[PDB]
Every structure is written in C-alpha cells, then in structure tokens.
Amino acid sequence: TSAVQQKLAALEKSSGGRLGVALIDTADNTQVLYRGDERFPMCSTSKVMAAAAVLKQSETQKQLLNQPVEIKPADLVNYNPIAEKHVNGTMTLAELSAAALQYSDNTAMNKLIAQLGGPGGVTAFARAIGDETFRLDRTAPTLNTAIPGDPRDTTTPRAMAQTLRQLTLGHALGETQRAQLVTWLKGNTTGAASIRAGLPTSWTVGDKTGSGDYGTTNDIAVIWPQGRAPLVLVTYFTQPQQNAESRRDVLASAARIIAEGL
C-alpha cells in the first residue's frame, strides 16, 4: 500500500461510497491503482468504446462518418439534447459520435450501438483491441442502472485505463481516427466538475463523464500535464443507496491526490 493509496483510502472512507482509480503515466508506463481490479458500472463512460468502434469502421469506409441516421420520435429516451432537434430528420454518424461524447446524448449512444449491431458489437470491438474485461450488455438508459453486484455494463479501472491509452495515445485506431477521438474528448462539455476540477488549470484534459443510479459518478480522462508526458486517469465512484446524490467532488479529490503524488 503506497502513500497515494492511503490518501485515496482516507478519501473513500469519508465519502461513504466505493472508489476505483487507475492511473497510467506514459512517461515511464507506471501505474497507480486503487481497487483497480474491482468491477464498477461504467455508465456513460462506455460511450468512448462505442464511438471508437465506429471510428474503426470508418477506416475502411471513407464516407461512413457522413452517413445519415434517421431519428424518430420513438428514439428519444431520458436525455437527448442534440437528438431531439433532429426528430423526423437525420444525424450523421459524426454528429452522433460528437453528441454522445461531448454532450452525453443517450439517443446518440443508442444509434452508435445500433450501427455496431447491438451492445455485443461494442464488446466485440473491446476484445479486438485486447480488452478482455469490458462488457456492454444494454442500451441507454438501462446501462446506467448501476446495481451493486450486477456484472452488466461494467469494467475495471485498470482495464479501462489501458484501453483509453491504446485508443487515444496508442495505435488501436488509425492516426486520423485517433486524432478525431482526442479532439472530441477535448471538446467535452460535461467534465469541469470532475477529474478536471482536481488538476492544475494549466493541464489539458479530454474526458468522458458518467452518472447512474446508486449515486454513481464516473470520469475517464487523458491528461496532458504542464511539461510532462500524458497521463490516463480513470475515476469510478458508486454508493450503497439507489437514490444517492452525485459526488463529482470525490472524483476531483481523487484526481488532486493523484496529481500531487506524481
């Protein structure tokens, strides 16, 4: 147990929930884990895998990201700020990817999942790029039920960190596609209260958040620190009671502890 792990344990104790953290520092490829091999519900952080899978498809179909997808009134779910503008019209797969990632539009995520042949298609992509832990089982919104003990729509912090690194900094995608994914993440709108809130302002972040029942509050980020090689940081958090409140501050606090321990 390291100093950083002891600080994260103290944070967890004061929070009353269960915290999972994985850092990869690409300066030396070293890792810092806290409950790194426990399963957590991904919620909307799973949207990175779906978007990446469609990017991979687009490597052998030049026009794919321009392909129109019909949005019907029945397609709208619980949170769909972009898709609801396009009901009885269309969005392109690029537009759906940006909406899913940057606004966490759930209807957009469901169109990505459909483009991949269902939740199993997203899992198949994960396996193809060497992630044996990720599983997507359901569409939105029910992929966010986040029930304790439920293996559906979960991964581990270690696994997600390794996959996010491969996607954004490694060679799981083609160069253009990797750049596009990083551009999308850097343009996230939802992130400022989470991992980013715990880091120095000068550090550049691209991230995807998630939320669900059981006060589940997630964020996965690729970080470019001032004067340092990039990091990849996963922070997962979930609480015992179904109607617990979000705790984005706990993610910020975890990020701060990680930053101060570099």
User: What DSSP element (H or E) covers 33?
Assistant: strand 30-34
Catalytic (active site) residue 44: yes
Query: Please, are residues 210 and 42 in contact by the beta-carbon 8 Å criterion?
Result: yes
Q: CB within 8 A of 73, min separation 6: which ones?
A: 87, 88
Query: Please, are residues 178 and 15 in contact by the beta-carbon 8 Å criterion?
Result: no
Nearest-angstrom CA–CA distance, 259 and 262: 6
Candidate list 2, 14, 44, 253, residue with the active-site label: 44
| Assigned token pair, 15 | 């929070």
Query: Please, are residues 148 and 238 in contact by the beta-carbon 8 Å criterion?
Result: yes
Residue that the structure tokens 């019209």 belong to: 89
Q: How many CB atoms are located within 10 Å of the residue 78 CB? A: 10
DSSP 18-30: EEEEEEEETTTTE
For residue 141, whether the previous peptide bond is cis, meaning omega lies within 30 degrees of 0, is yes
Nearest-angstrom CA–CA distance, 107 and 88: 14
Nearest-angstrom CA–CA distance, 42 and 161: 12
For the annotated catalytic residues, the residue numbers are 44
